Amino acid sequence: KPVSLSYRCPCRFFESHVARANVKHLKILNTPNCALQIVARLKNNNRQVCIDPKLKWIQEYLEKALNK
């Protein structure tokens, strides 16, 4: 299984337990029924990860940017 049945959605996986300090850049991607998917790249590890929008530091992130 390659994990793709006509993949309509970017993030089929999310990273839980992530650091505000290990991520260089957050870019959130919303998809109709695949919900809110966060895309973030790490600084040193440089990996592109999908961040789960229920993470606590992420809460702080959207609280800020959305209350802004």
Curated annotation (Swiss-Prot):
Changing residue 49 to A: Impaired CXCR4 activation. The record marks 24, 27, 43 as: Important for integrin interaction and activation. Changing residue 8 to Q: Greatly impaired chemotactic activity and enhanced inhibition by heparin. Residues 8-12 are annotated as: Receptor and heparin binding. Changing residue 7 to H: No significant effect on CXCR4 binding or activation. Disulfide bonds join 9-34, 11-50. The record marks 25 as: Important for dimer formation. Changing residue 12 to Q: Slightly impaired chemotactic activity and enhanced inhibition by heparin. Greatly impaired chemotactic activity. A motif (Receptor activation motif) lies at residues 1-2. It comes from the Eukaryota. Changing residue 65 to C: Formation of an intermolecular disulfide bond, leading to a locked dimer. No effect on CXCR4 activation, but loss of chemotactic activity. Changing residue 13 to A: No effect on anti-HIV-1 and chemotactic activities. Slightly impaired chemotactic activity and no effect on inhibition by heparin. Residues 18-20, 27-29, 39-49 are annotated as: Receptor binding. Changing residue 2 to G: Abolished CXCR4 activation ability, but only slightly impaired binding to the receptor. Changing residue 8 to K: Slightly impaired binding and activation of CXCR4. Changing residue 24 to S: 55-fold reduction in binding affinity for Link domain of TNFAIP6. Changing residue 25 to S: 55-fold reduction in binding affinity for Link domain of TNFAIP6. Changing residue 47 to E: Greatly impaired CXCR4 activation. This is SDF-1-alpha(3-67). The lineage of its organism: Eukaryota, Metazoa, Chordata, Craniata, Vertebrata. The gene is CXCL12. The chain holds residues 22 to 89 of 93 of the full protein.
